[PDB]
């Protein structure tokens, strides 16, 4: 019978060829599916920010009745952050779909276009819901909590470093043969329907003769958690540990996290988390535990609950 | 005739099985070389520091007339800064090989015996000289400039990620096939056989709805140098950026580096390098241009400058 | 009450006969009681079609008897017996093969700690419905995708497609993927009745490439041809024209790739349906041959066994 | 004054006959004098010893007339020609193949930009000297170590041994790297007098192989095979027999591996001393037959093949 109704919800600028006329821009889109563009918000990934990401998460709750699928365009540059907020914030369970271009759209080879139309074929395949928040890019379907830019400038940058991609694009079909096992969506118990804005977490960097300064600039403003990306398997630089154990004494929630691009930074293995109060990242890389740290902290300030948090979601 | 002698030098705990009694430890390196140790320094990697440094390449330089080359042995997680360091710094071109292990040396199939082995092969052969110095781990020969962890905890985390390795190591023979092009050891200008201390520089992450506080306690504590952990390619937070273009104007050196594991931060791609005096870190992730910028800084503290020198080193 | 673990060797020992483990590697008996049993003596490299059958038997026997297998088995053909366990093994308690990248004897052996991290893997209940296990370098991965990427790397085993399934520290498993395409119990494959399988060989595409391999093979009735294609699963001219003629005949013919990672897709570069070909999808050619032996115990038409291929 | 390129075409059009470029892609304008021409029109999965023979002299002969070459090639095959070419041209001028994933008419069409970037690689005289170059996805790799790591994916081709020689970024190169072997003006390789090469063929190992196709290469005279073994180079029972015998016999036989990184390393698995064996080192199965085809156009011992196996 009949095609599917695509939402795309942009963020920023045309990724392809006027959110209005992508259907202009993609011809193509208009044999996948029937296409509706709404522009929320024109910002730069660089600037992203939580008061938007409240936004988007609001807007997809009391839209998802109204469509079969969202596709979100999206600079690349904190994808992977905003990616993992919908993933653990957006109740509806239909495909929720992010999507880019590394290319600028009036440059040659430009992969935005078909980007967009492998995005649309996402948000539009039924097995593609129930998935979580999804990441379309170079052929490849990845969830948002595991996906990562690895590149500054290829146009394969975007993989899910740990554990994956769940699918591959081929002539407009899907094989997928994973599913992320955390939980996420309709299964977690954010909601942020009701804020208006989200605890502060900063992160600090470790590296050899490291400054405590800015872990120490944190505390003094009243930060609610800091995230540490250590080095190695989340270790600290001795000014930085010292600092932080001193806030996290003091009621500030301490992740640690690691530089380290791959791998889990493990609990009790390098530290003594329980000794000091801190939890371990597991996976997720400082930017992605700053995100779920925020979550954590509208439900709870005690660390053993926040580390039972990172180890389920 | 006879075997070259080969001088370890220890800045950490044992790696293997008392630095003079590695040899007891792994009795096979008695048949590679004369083996001598020394403890320089006794540290965890993760509180490596600029004093550390200094030390380790006054001695190397002191003492390269009396020994064929020199093994390292040193913890991983800062590993890649301190290879680096050296690799600018040391103006010795016989064999300078820096060595860890990813298991502690107790536990079931620890990878330290064999890398040290293969550090001493390494140290020993004489095609490794005039290749700067070297990282060797997981029977591979990496160079100190490209060479950086990309897991938290598997045997094989170091890589060469944009360059690839030197060579390989296969039965105590190594194939060859490629020498680093930048400039080091010999042929830089950086001699720091009369500092006892280095400029002060420091790192700021970015991510989405970043703090400016990092950025602001470093300037106001007069740092030398600021590197920023870019998003991208090496795009900055908008308070970041307003606060790092204040302080180039001021006289603060800044580099922009990313936070993405690999490629390299282009001159104005993305920001405006020359209107603001920021500097492009090309392949250099944030902690070894932490390593160049300091170096840079003995030197010069115009931004033209500083930029020449990340082309060539 | 610590779990029952057997341990089934197929060759030389990886740590340290098959009883010698506990010995060799004592803090296994903080973690399972642990039984030993030799198979068969074979090199890796040596293996074949009756050590499969065996295999498969024996497990599907024991199942009741014990918690979990270990199978001990050299790291060169791993990735093909991992997946003809995967598709005919019928007991979903966990079956987790293992081995060694540098011998025994070797300074910083790996075996030891990859044969504790197989015996923690399969003494987990988690472990159990995900098929058959690889456990190599503190790393869980699955049957079907798991090849060696590096011929002497410790870290050799991947999942180079979908991943892996979980990661191992300190004795603890993270499990945050399983397998989607159809596994042990969930297959119609049966070999408890076969004592051989149907013959598939494999050949390799390349520049100015022989069709000889290809004619000695369909020359012998061979019942399956498994091209390993150029690209996309391409094949070289006159190698194309000796498998579409073989095809016409009743040979089965399934196009791979030698390129190591990516499908091998349908109708795409070669029109399939015309032809009678089947794509072997994400299936490299060694292991598309495992499916295709199997696809032939139930079917010769080519359509059923693309569908075979979509779901396995 | 803007450098002269030659492009030379092997088969279709990578963006959009072979003068029409300049069309395509105005923007080569800017970087190059471009002229064109067509040298065989063929598809790579077809490619034949006749089309690097033809390269080769075209290339050898018109070096004094251009500034450097841009040579479009399919593909599926592109890691052999390139390897072939990097031991048989004489010019030291940039000798550049690009190719394209995507069709000219797929949305998000590679070959454009890749065309353009083959033309500032071969336009850049730090470029000369590095041996034959195959430019993709913004990156220059050298012919050697170059290999299609998946099947679809655009950013497929990567020298997985050693890395890239260098990277492009706003049309401006940042070189940090060499190939160490010798290459083209080095080498003792000839073929200006030659119309045909000696005929290597390849045979795959697997679980349960079957020795027919390495036999109907022997009894065909082939003067050299070259085994995709499994692991470090191993080879199955019977091909391993079947192989010796014709070692012995006077064909010359390579050990390389399935296995798509690392080196089939010498003595270690087998003992290629006392079989007459040559190990490959680094190069894949398809790379070793080049070599080797180059080799026997020399000598037919095996201890002088080793060595031009360990430099070359």
């Known amino acids: 019978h009949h095609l599917p109704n695509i939402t795309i919800l942009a963020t920023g600028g045309t990724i392809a060829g006027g959110v209005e006329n992508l ?16 522009q929320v918000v024109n910002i730069g990934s660089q600037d992203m920010n939580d008061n938007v990401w409240l ?21 690349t540059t904190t994808m992977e952050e905003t990616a993992y907020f919908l993933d653990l914030t957006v109740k509806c ?10 290319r600028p ?15 649309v074929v996402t948000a539009a395949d039924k097995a593609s819901a129930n998935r979580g928040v999804l990441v379309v890019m170079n052929d490849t379907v ?13 146009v394969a940058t975007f993989k899910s470093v740990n554990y994956g991609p769940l699918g591959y694009i081929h002539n407009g079909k899907i094989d997928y043969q994973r599913t992320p096992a955390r939980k996420h969506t309709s299964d977690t118990p954010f909601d942020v329907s009701k804020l208006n804005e989200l605890p502060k977490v900063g992160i600090v ?18 930060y609610d958690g800091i995230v540490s990306a250590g080095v190695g398997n989340g270790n600290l630089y001795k000014s930085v540990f010292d600092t932080l154990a001193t806030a996290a004494k003091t009621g500030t929630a301490v992740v640690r996290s690691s530089r380290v691009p791959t791998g889990a930074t493990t609990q009790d293995a390098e530290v003594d988390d329980a000794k000091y109060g801190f939890v ?8 992605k535990a700053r995100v ?3 979550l954590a902290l509208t439900q709870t300030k005690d660390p053993q609950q926040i580390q039972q948090i990172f180890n389920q979601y």
């Open 142 to 154: 990845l969830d948002g909590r595991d996906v990562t830019t690895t590149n500054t400038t290829d």
């Open 292 to 294: 779920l740290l925020q």
């Open 55 to 75: 936004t988007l998460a609001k807007k997809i709750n009391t839209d998802c009745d109204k469509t079969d699928g969202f596709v979100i365009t999206h600079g």
């Open 205 to 222: 960097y470790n590296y050899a003769n490291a400054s405590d300064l800015p872990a120490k600039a944190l505390v003094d403003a009243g």
């Open 93 to 102: 369970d239909k495909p929720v779909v992010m999507v880019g271009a590394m």
């Open 280 to 287: 371990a990242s597991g996976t997720l890389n400082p930017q």
């Open 105 to 119: 759209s009036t440059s040659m080879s430009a992969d935005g276009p078909f980007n967009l139309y492998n995005a």
């Open 23 to 38: 259907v202009n821009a993609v011809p193509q889109l208009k044999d996948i599916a029937n296409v509706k563009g709404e």
